[PDB]
Amino acid sequence: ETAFVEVVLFESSPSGDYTTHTTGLTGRFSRAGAMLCAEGEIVQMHPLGLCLYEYGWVGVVKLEQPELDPKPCLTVLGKAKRAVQRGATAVIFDVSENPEAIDQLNQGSEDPLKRPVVYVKGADAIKLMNIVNKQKVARARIQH
Protein backbone atom coordinates (compact mmCIF):
# COMPACT_ATOMS: atom_id res chain seq x y z
CA GLU A 1 0.00 0.00 0.00
CA THR A 2 2.84 2.52 0.29
CA ALA A 3 3.61 4.46 -2.86
CA PHE A 4 7.10 5.66 -3.65
CA VAL A 5 6.85 8.81 -5.74
CA GLU A 6 9.83 10.32 -7.55
CA VAL A 7 9.58 13.75 -9.14
CA VAL A 8 12.14 14.44 -11.89
CA LEU A 9 13.38 17.77 -13.17
CA PHE A 10 15.48 17.71 -16.36
CA GLU A 11 17.59 19.83 -18.70
CA SER A 12 19.44 18.84 -21.89
CA SER A 13 22.83 19.98 -23.06
CA PRO A 14 24.15 21.12 -26.37
CA SER A 15 25.43 17.51 -26.45
CA GLY A 16 21.81 16.17 -26.28
CA ASP A 17 22.44 14.42 -22.89
CA TYR A 18 20.05 15.11 -20.08
CA THR A 19 20.84 16.47 -16.67
CA THR A 20 18.20 15.33 -14.14
CA HIS A 21 17.30 16.14 -10.56
CA THR A 22 15.13 13.72 -8.59
CA THR A 23 13.05 14.02 -5.38
CA GLY A 24 11.56 11.01 -3.62
CA LEU A 25 8.56 11.17 -1.34
CA THR A 26 5.99 8.83 0.08
CA GLY A 27 2.25 8.37 -0.31
CA ARG A 28 -0.45 5.72 -0.22
CA PHE A 29 -2.23 3.83 -2.96
CA SER A 30 -5.93 4.17 -2.68
CA ARG A 31 -8.12 1.00 -2.89
CA ALA A 32 -10.17 3.03 -5.31
CA GLY A 33 -7.51 2.16 -7.96
CA ALA A 34 -4.73 -0.26 -9.00
CA MET A 35 -1.59 -0.69 -6.86
CA LEU A 36 0.57 -0.50 -10.03
CA CYS A 37 3.43 1.35 -11.77
CA ALA A 38 2.85 4.67 -13.43
CA GLU A 39 5.11 7.29 -14.98
CA GLY A 40 4.44 10.50 -16.92
CA GLU A 41 4.69 14.23 -17.21
CA ILE A 42 3.03 16.01 -14.28
CA VAL A 43 -0.11 18.07 -15.05
CA GLN A 44 -1.24 20.16 -12.14
CA MET A 45 -5.03 20.30 -12.20
CA HIS A 46 -7.42 22.36 -10.05
CA PRO A 47 -10.08 19.87 -8.59
CA LEU A 48 -12.84 22.02 -10.14
CA GLY A 49 -10.92 21.62 -13.35
CA LEU A 50 -12.23 17.99 -13.39
CA CYS A 51 -15.91 19.01 -13.61
CA LEU A 52 -6.65 18.56 -23.70
CA TYR A 53 -3.37 16.84 -22.65
CA GLU A 54 -1.32 14.19 -24.44
CA TYR A 55 -2.09 10.63 -23.29
CA GLY A 56 -0.19 9.42 -20.20
CA TRP A 57 0.07 12.41 -17.86
CA VAL A 58 0.17 12.20 -14.10
CA GLY A 59 -2.45 14.52 -12.54
CA VAL A 60 -1.48 16.35 -9.41
CA VAL A 61 -4.54 17.70 -7.58
CA LYS A 62 -4.50 19.66 -4.31
CA LEU A 63 -7.91 19.09 -2.70
CA GLU A 64 -9.58 22.32 -1.66
CA GLN A 65 -11.31 23.26 1.58
CA PRO A 66 -14.27 20.95 2.03
CA GLU A 67 -16.21 24.09 2.98
CA LEU A 68 -14.88 25.84 -0.11
CA ASP A 69 -16.47 23.22 -2.44
CA PRO A 70 -19.39 22.02 -0.30
CA LYS A 71 -21.38 20.92 -3.39
CA PRO A 72 -18.81 19.05 -5.61
CA CYS A 73 -19.71 18.10 -9.24
CA LEU A 74 -18.23 14.64 -8.65
CA THR A 75 -16.75 12.73 -5.77
CA VAL A 76 -12.95 12.61 -5.32
CA LEU A 77 -12.95 9.17 -6.91
CA GLY A 78 -15.21 10.30 -9.80
CA LYS A 79 -12.71 13.10 -10.47
CA ALA A 80 -9.97 10.56 -10.69
CA LYS A 81 -11.90 8.46 -13.31
CA ARG A 82 -12.56 11.66 -15.12
CA ALA A 83 -8.79 12.29 -15.13
CA VAL A 84 -8.10 8.86 -16.47
CA GLN A 85 -10.81 9.16 -19.15
CA ARG A 86 -8.84 12.25 -20.26
CA GLY A 87 -5.54 10.34 -20.58
CA ALA A 88 -4.09 10.30 -17.03
CA THR A 89 -1.92 7.28 -16.22
CA ALA A 90 -2.01 8.23 -12.51
CA VAL A 91 -3.66 10.67 -10.15
CA ILE A 92 -1.96 12.07 -7.06
CA PHE A 93 -4.17 13.86 -4.63
CA ASP A 94 -2.83 16.19 -2.00
CA VAL A 95 -5.39 15.64 0.69
CA SER A 96 -3.86 17.98 3.32
CA GLU A 97 -6.67 20.54 3.33
CA ASN A 98 -9.23 17.76 3.03
CA PRO A 99 -8.19 14.78 5.08
CA GLU A 100 -11.66 13.29 4.99
CA ALA A 101 -11.08 12.23 1.41
CA ILE A 102 -8.85 9.42 2.70
CA ASP A 103 -11.91 7.55 4.06
CA GLN A 104 -13.63 7.79 0.66
CA LEU A 105 -10.38 6.73 -1.16
CA ASN A 106 -9.70 3.66 0.99
CA GLN A 107 -13.17 2.36 0.47
CA GLY A 108 -12.73 -0.73 -1.62
CA SER A 109 -14.59 -0.30 -4.87
CA GLU A 110 -16.05 -3.06 -6.99
CA ASP A 111 -15.14 -1.73 -10.43
CA PRO A 112 -11.94 0.10 -9.20
CA LEU A 113 -9.69 2.21 -11.54
CA LYS A 114 -7.21 0.38 -13.68
CA ARG A 115 -4.60 3.10 -12.97
CA PRO A 116 -3.15 4.27 -9.63
CA VAL A 117 -4.72 6.82 -7.35
CA VAL A 118 -2.14 8.03 -4.84
CA TYR A 119 -2.71 10.34 -1.88
CA VAL A 120 -0.09 12.34 -0.10
CA LYS A 121 -0.22 14.67 2.91
CA GLY A 122 2.16 16.23 5.46
CA ALA A 123 5.80 16.79 4.58
CA ASP A 124 5.56 14.61 1.44
CA ALA A 125 2.71 16.78 0.06
CA ILE A 126 4.77 19.89 0.76
CA LYS A 127 7.81 18.54 -1.13
CA LEU A 128 5.67 17.46 -4.03
CA MET A 129 3.88 20.89 -4.23
CA ASN A 130 7.05 22.77 -3.80
CA ILE A 131 8.22 21.26 -7.08
CA VAL A 132 5.05 21.23 -9.12
CA ASN A 133 4.40 24.87 -8.11
CA LYS A 134 7.98 25.90 -9.06
CA GLN A 135 8.87 24.01 -12.29
CA LYS A 136 6.69 24.17 -15.34
CA VAL A 137 8.11 20.76 -16.39
CA ALA A 138 8.48 17.69 -14.26
CA ARG A 139 7.96 13.96 -14.45
CA ALA A 140 6.42 11.71 -11.84
CA ARG A 141 7.18 8.02 -11.43
CA ILE A 142 4.94 6.03 -9.01
CA GLN A 143 5.73 2.52 -7.58
CA HIS A 144 5.61 -0.12 -4.66
Place this chain on the structure above:
Amino acid sequence: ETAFVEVVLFESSPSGDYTTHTTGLTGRFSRAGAMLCAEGEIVQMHPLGLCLYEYGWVGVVKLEQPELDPKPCLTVLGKAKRAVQRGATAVIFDVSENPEAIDQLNQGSEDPLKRPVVYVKGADAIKLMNIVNKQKVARARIQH
Protein backbone atom coordinates in the same frame (compact mmCIF):
# COMPACT_ATOMS: atom_id res chain seq x y z
CA GLU B 1 13.09 -11.15 -13.33
CA THR B 2 10.10 -11.37 -15.69
CA ALA B 3 9.01 -8.08 -17.22
CA PHE B 4 5.41 -7.41 -18.11
CA VAL B 5 5.31 -4.99 -21.02
CA GLU B 6 2.13 -3.23 -22.13
CA VAL B 7 2.05 -1.28 -25.38
CA VAL B 8 -0.72 1.35 -25.60
CA LEU B 9 -2.26 2.89 -28.69
CA PHE B 10 -4.54 5.90 -28.14
CA GLU B 11 -6.93 8.30 -29.87
CA SER B 12 -8.90 11.24 -28.42
CA SER B 13 -12.43 12.29 -29.20
CA PRO B 14 -14.02 15.60 -29.89
CA SER B 15 -15.05 15.21 -26.22
CA GLY B 16 -11.35 15.15 -25.14
CA ASP B 17 -11.64 11.56 -23.74
CA TYR B 18 -9.14 9.00 -24.87
CA THR B 19 -9.81 5.71 -26.55
CA THR B 20 -6.95 3.26 -25.86
CA HIS B 21 -5.89 -0.14 -27.12
CA THR B 22 -3.45 -2.21 -25.06
CA THR B 23 -1.20 -5.22 -25.85
CA GLY B 24 0.60 -7.18 -23.14
CA LEU B 25 3.72 -9.21 -23.74
CA THR B 26 6.53 -10.70 -21.74
CA GLY B 27 10.26 -10.11 -21.47
CA ARG B 28 13.14 -10.29 -19.01
CA PHE B 29 14.87 -7.65 -16.94
CA SER B 30 18.55 -7.64 -17.54
CA ARG B 31 20.93 -7.62 -14.51
CA ALA B 32 22.69 -4.86 -16.38
CA GLY B 33 19.93 -2.51 -15.06
CA ALA B 34 17.26 -1.92 -12.37
CA MET B 35 14.30 -4.31 -11.99
CA LEU B 36 11.94 -1.29 -11.70
CA CYS B 37 8.86 0.44 -13.16
CA ALA B 38 9.10 2.47 -16.31
CA GLU B 39 6.58 4.14 -18.60
CA GLY B 40 6.91 6.45 -21.61
CA GLU B 41 6.39 7.11 -25.26
CA ILE B 42 8.10 4.51 -27.45
CA VAL B 43 11.04 5.71 -29.61
CA GLN B 44 12.20 3.12 -32.07
CA MET B 45 15.96 3.45 -32.43
CA HIS B 46 18.33 1.70 -34.86
CA PRO B 47 21.24 0.17 -32.72
CA LEU B 48 23.75 2.12 -34.85
CA GLY B 49 21.66 5.14 -33.97
CA LEU B 50 23.21 4.89 -30.45
CA CYS B 51 26.79 5.46 -31.66
CA LEU B 52 16.99 14.79 -29.54
CA TYR B 53 13.90 13.34 -27.75
CA GLU B 54 11.93 14.69 -24.79
CA TYR B 55 13.02 13.22 -21.43
CA GLY B 56 11.39 9.90 -20.46
CA TRP B 57 11.07 7.88 -23.66
CA VAL B 58 11.22 4.12 -23.87
CA GLY B 59 13.76 3.00 -26.50
CA VAL B 60 12.87 0.03 -28.60
CA VAL B 61 15.94 -1.44 -30.33
CA LYS B 62 15.96 -4.48 -32.63
CA LEU B 63 19.49 -5.90 -32.46
CA GLU B 64 21.00 -6.47 -35.88
CA GLN B 65 22.86 -9.47 -37.28
CA PRO B 66 25.99 -9.96 -35.22
CA GLU B 67 27.77 -10.44 -38.56
CA LEU B 68 26.13 -7.28 -39.86
CA ASP B 69 27.75 -5.14 -37.11
CA PRO B 70 30.87 -7.18 -36.34
CA LYS B 71 32.74 -4.10 -35.03
CA PRO B 72 30.17 -2.27 -32.77
CA CYS B 73 30.91 1.29 -31.48
CA LEU B 74 29.71 0.24 -28.02
CA THR B 75 28.55 -2.92 -26.35
CA VAL B 76 24.79 -3.65 -26.05
CA LEU B 77 24.93 -2.43 -22.46
CA GLY B 78 26.93 0.71 -23.41
CA LYS B 79 24.21 1.50 -25.95
CA ALA B 80 21.63 1.26 -23.24
CA LYS B 81 23.54 3.77 -20.99
CA ARG B 82 23.87 5.95 -24.01
CA ALA B 83 20.08 5.77 -24.39
CA VAL B 84 19.54 6.68 -20.80
CA GLN B 85 22.06 9.56 -20.97
CA ARG B 86 19.81 10.85 -23.79
CA GLY B 87 16.63 10.74 -21.66
CA ALA B 88 15.41 7.12 -21.92
CA THR B 89 13.51 5.84 -18.88
CA ALA B 90 13.76 2.27 -20.24
CA VAL B 91 15.38 0.30 -23.02
CA ILE B 92 13.79 -2.73 -24.65
CA PHE B 93 16.01 -4.80 -26.83
CA ASP B 94 14.68 -7.25 -29.35
CA VAL B 95 17.43 -9.81 -29.26
CA SER B 96 15.91 -12.27 -31.77
CA GLU B 97 18.53 -11.82 -34.48
CA ASN B 98 21.25 -11.64 -31.85
CA PRO B 99 20.54 -14.06 -29.05
CA GLU B 100 24.10 -13.89 -27.78
CA ALA B 101 23.37 -10.49 -26.30
CA ILE B 102 21.42 -12.22 -23.52
CA ASP B 103 24.68 -13.56 -22.00
CA GLN B 104 26.17 -10.05 -21.97
CA LEU B 105 22.89 -8.57 -20.52
CA ASN B 106 22.56 -11.07 -17.67
CA GLN B 107 26.07 -10.46 -16.54
CA GLY B 108 25.72 -8.74 -13.21
CA SER B 109 27.34 -5.35 -13.39
CA GLU B 110 28.86 -3.44 -10.51
CA ASP B 111 27.64 0.05 -11.39
CA PRO B 112 24.41 -1.19 -13.15
CA LEU B 113 21.88 1.20 -14.84
CA LYS B 114 19.40 2.96 -12.64
CA ARG B 115 16.66 2.37 -15.25
CA PRO B 116 15.34 -0.92 -16.70
CA VAL B 117 16.87 -2.81 -19.58
CA VAL B 118 14.38 -5.35 -20.89
CA TYR B 119 14.97 -8.00 -23.55
CA VAL B 120 12.33 -9.73 -25.57
CA LYS B 121 12.48 -12.46 -28.22
CA GLY B 122 10.17 -14.99 -29.90
CA ALA B 123 6.45 -14.30 -30.13
CA ASP B 124 6.64 -11.40 -27.64
CA ALA B 125 9.24 -9.61 -29.82
CA ILE B 126 7.03 -10.12 -32.86
CA LYS B 127 3.97 -8.59 -31.12
CA LEU B 128 6.00 -5.68 -29.86
CA MET B 129 7.54 -5.00 -33.35
CA ASN B 130 4.27 -5.45 -35.07
CA ILE B 131 3.01 -2.43 -33.14
CA VAL B 132 6.05 -0.20 -33.07
CA ASN B 133 6.51 -0.76 -36.83
CA LYS B 134 2.81 0.05 -37.53
CA GLN B 135 1.86 2.98 -35.25
CA LYS B 136 3.84 6.18 -35.21
CA VAL B 137 2.59 6.76 -31.62
CA ALA B 138 2.56 4.29 -28.78
CA ARG B 139 3.32 4.13 -25.09
CA ALA B 140 5.17 1.41 -23.24
CA ARG B 141 4.69 0.55 -19.59
CA ILE B 142 7.21 -1.91 -18.02
CA GLN B 143 6.75 -3.75 -14.64
CA HIS B 144 7.23 -6.92 -12.36
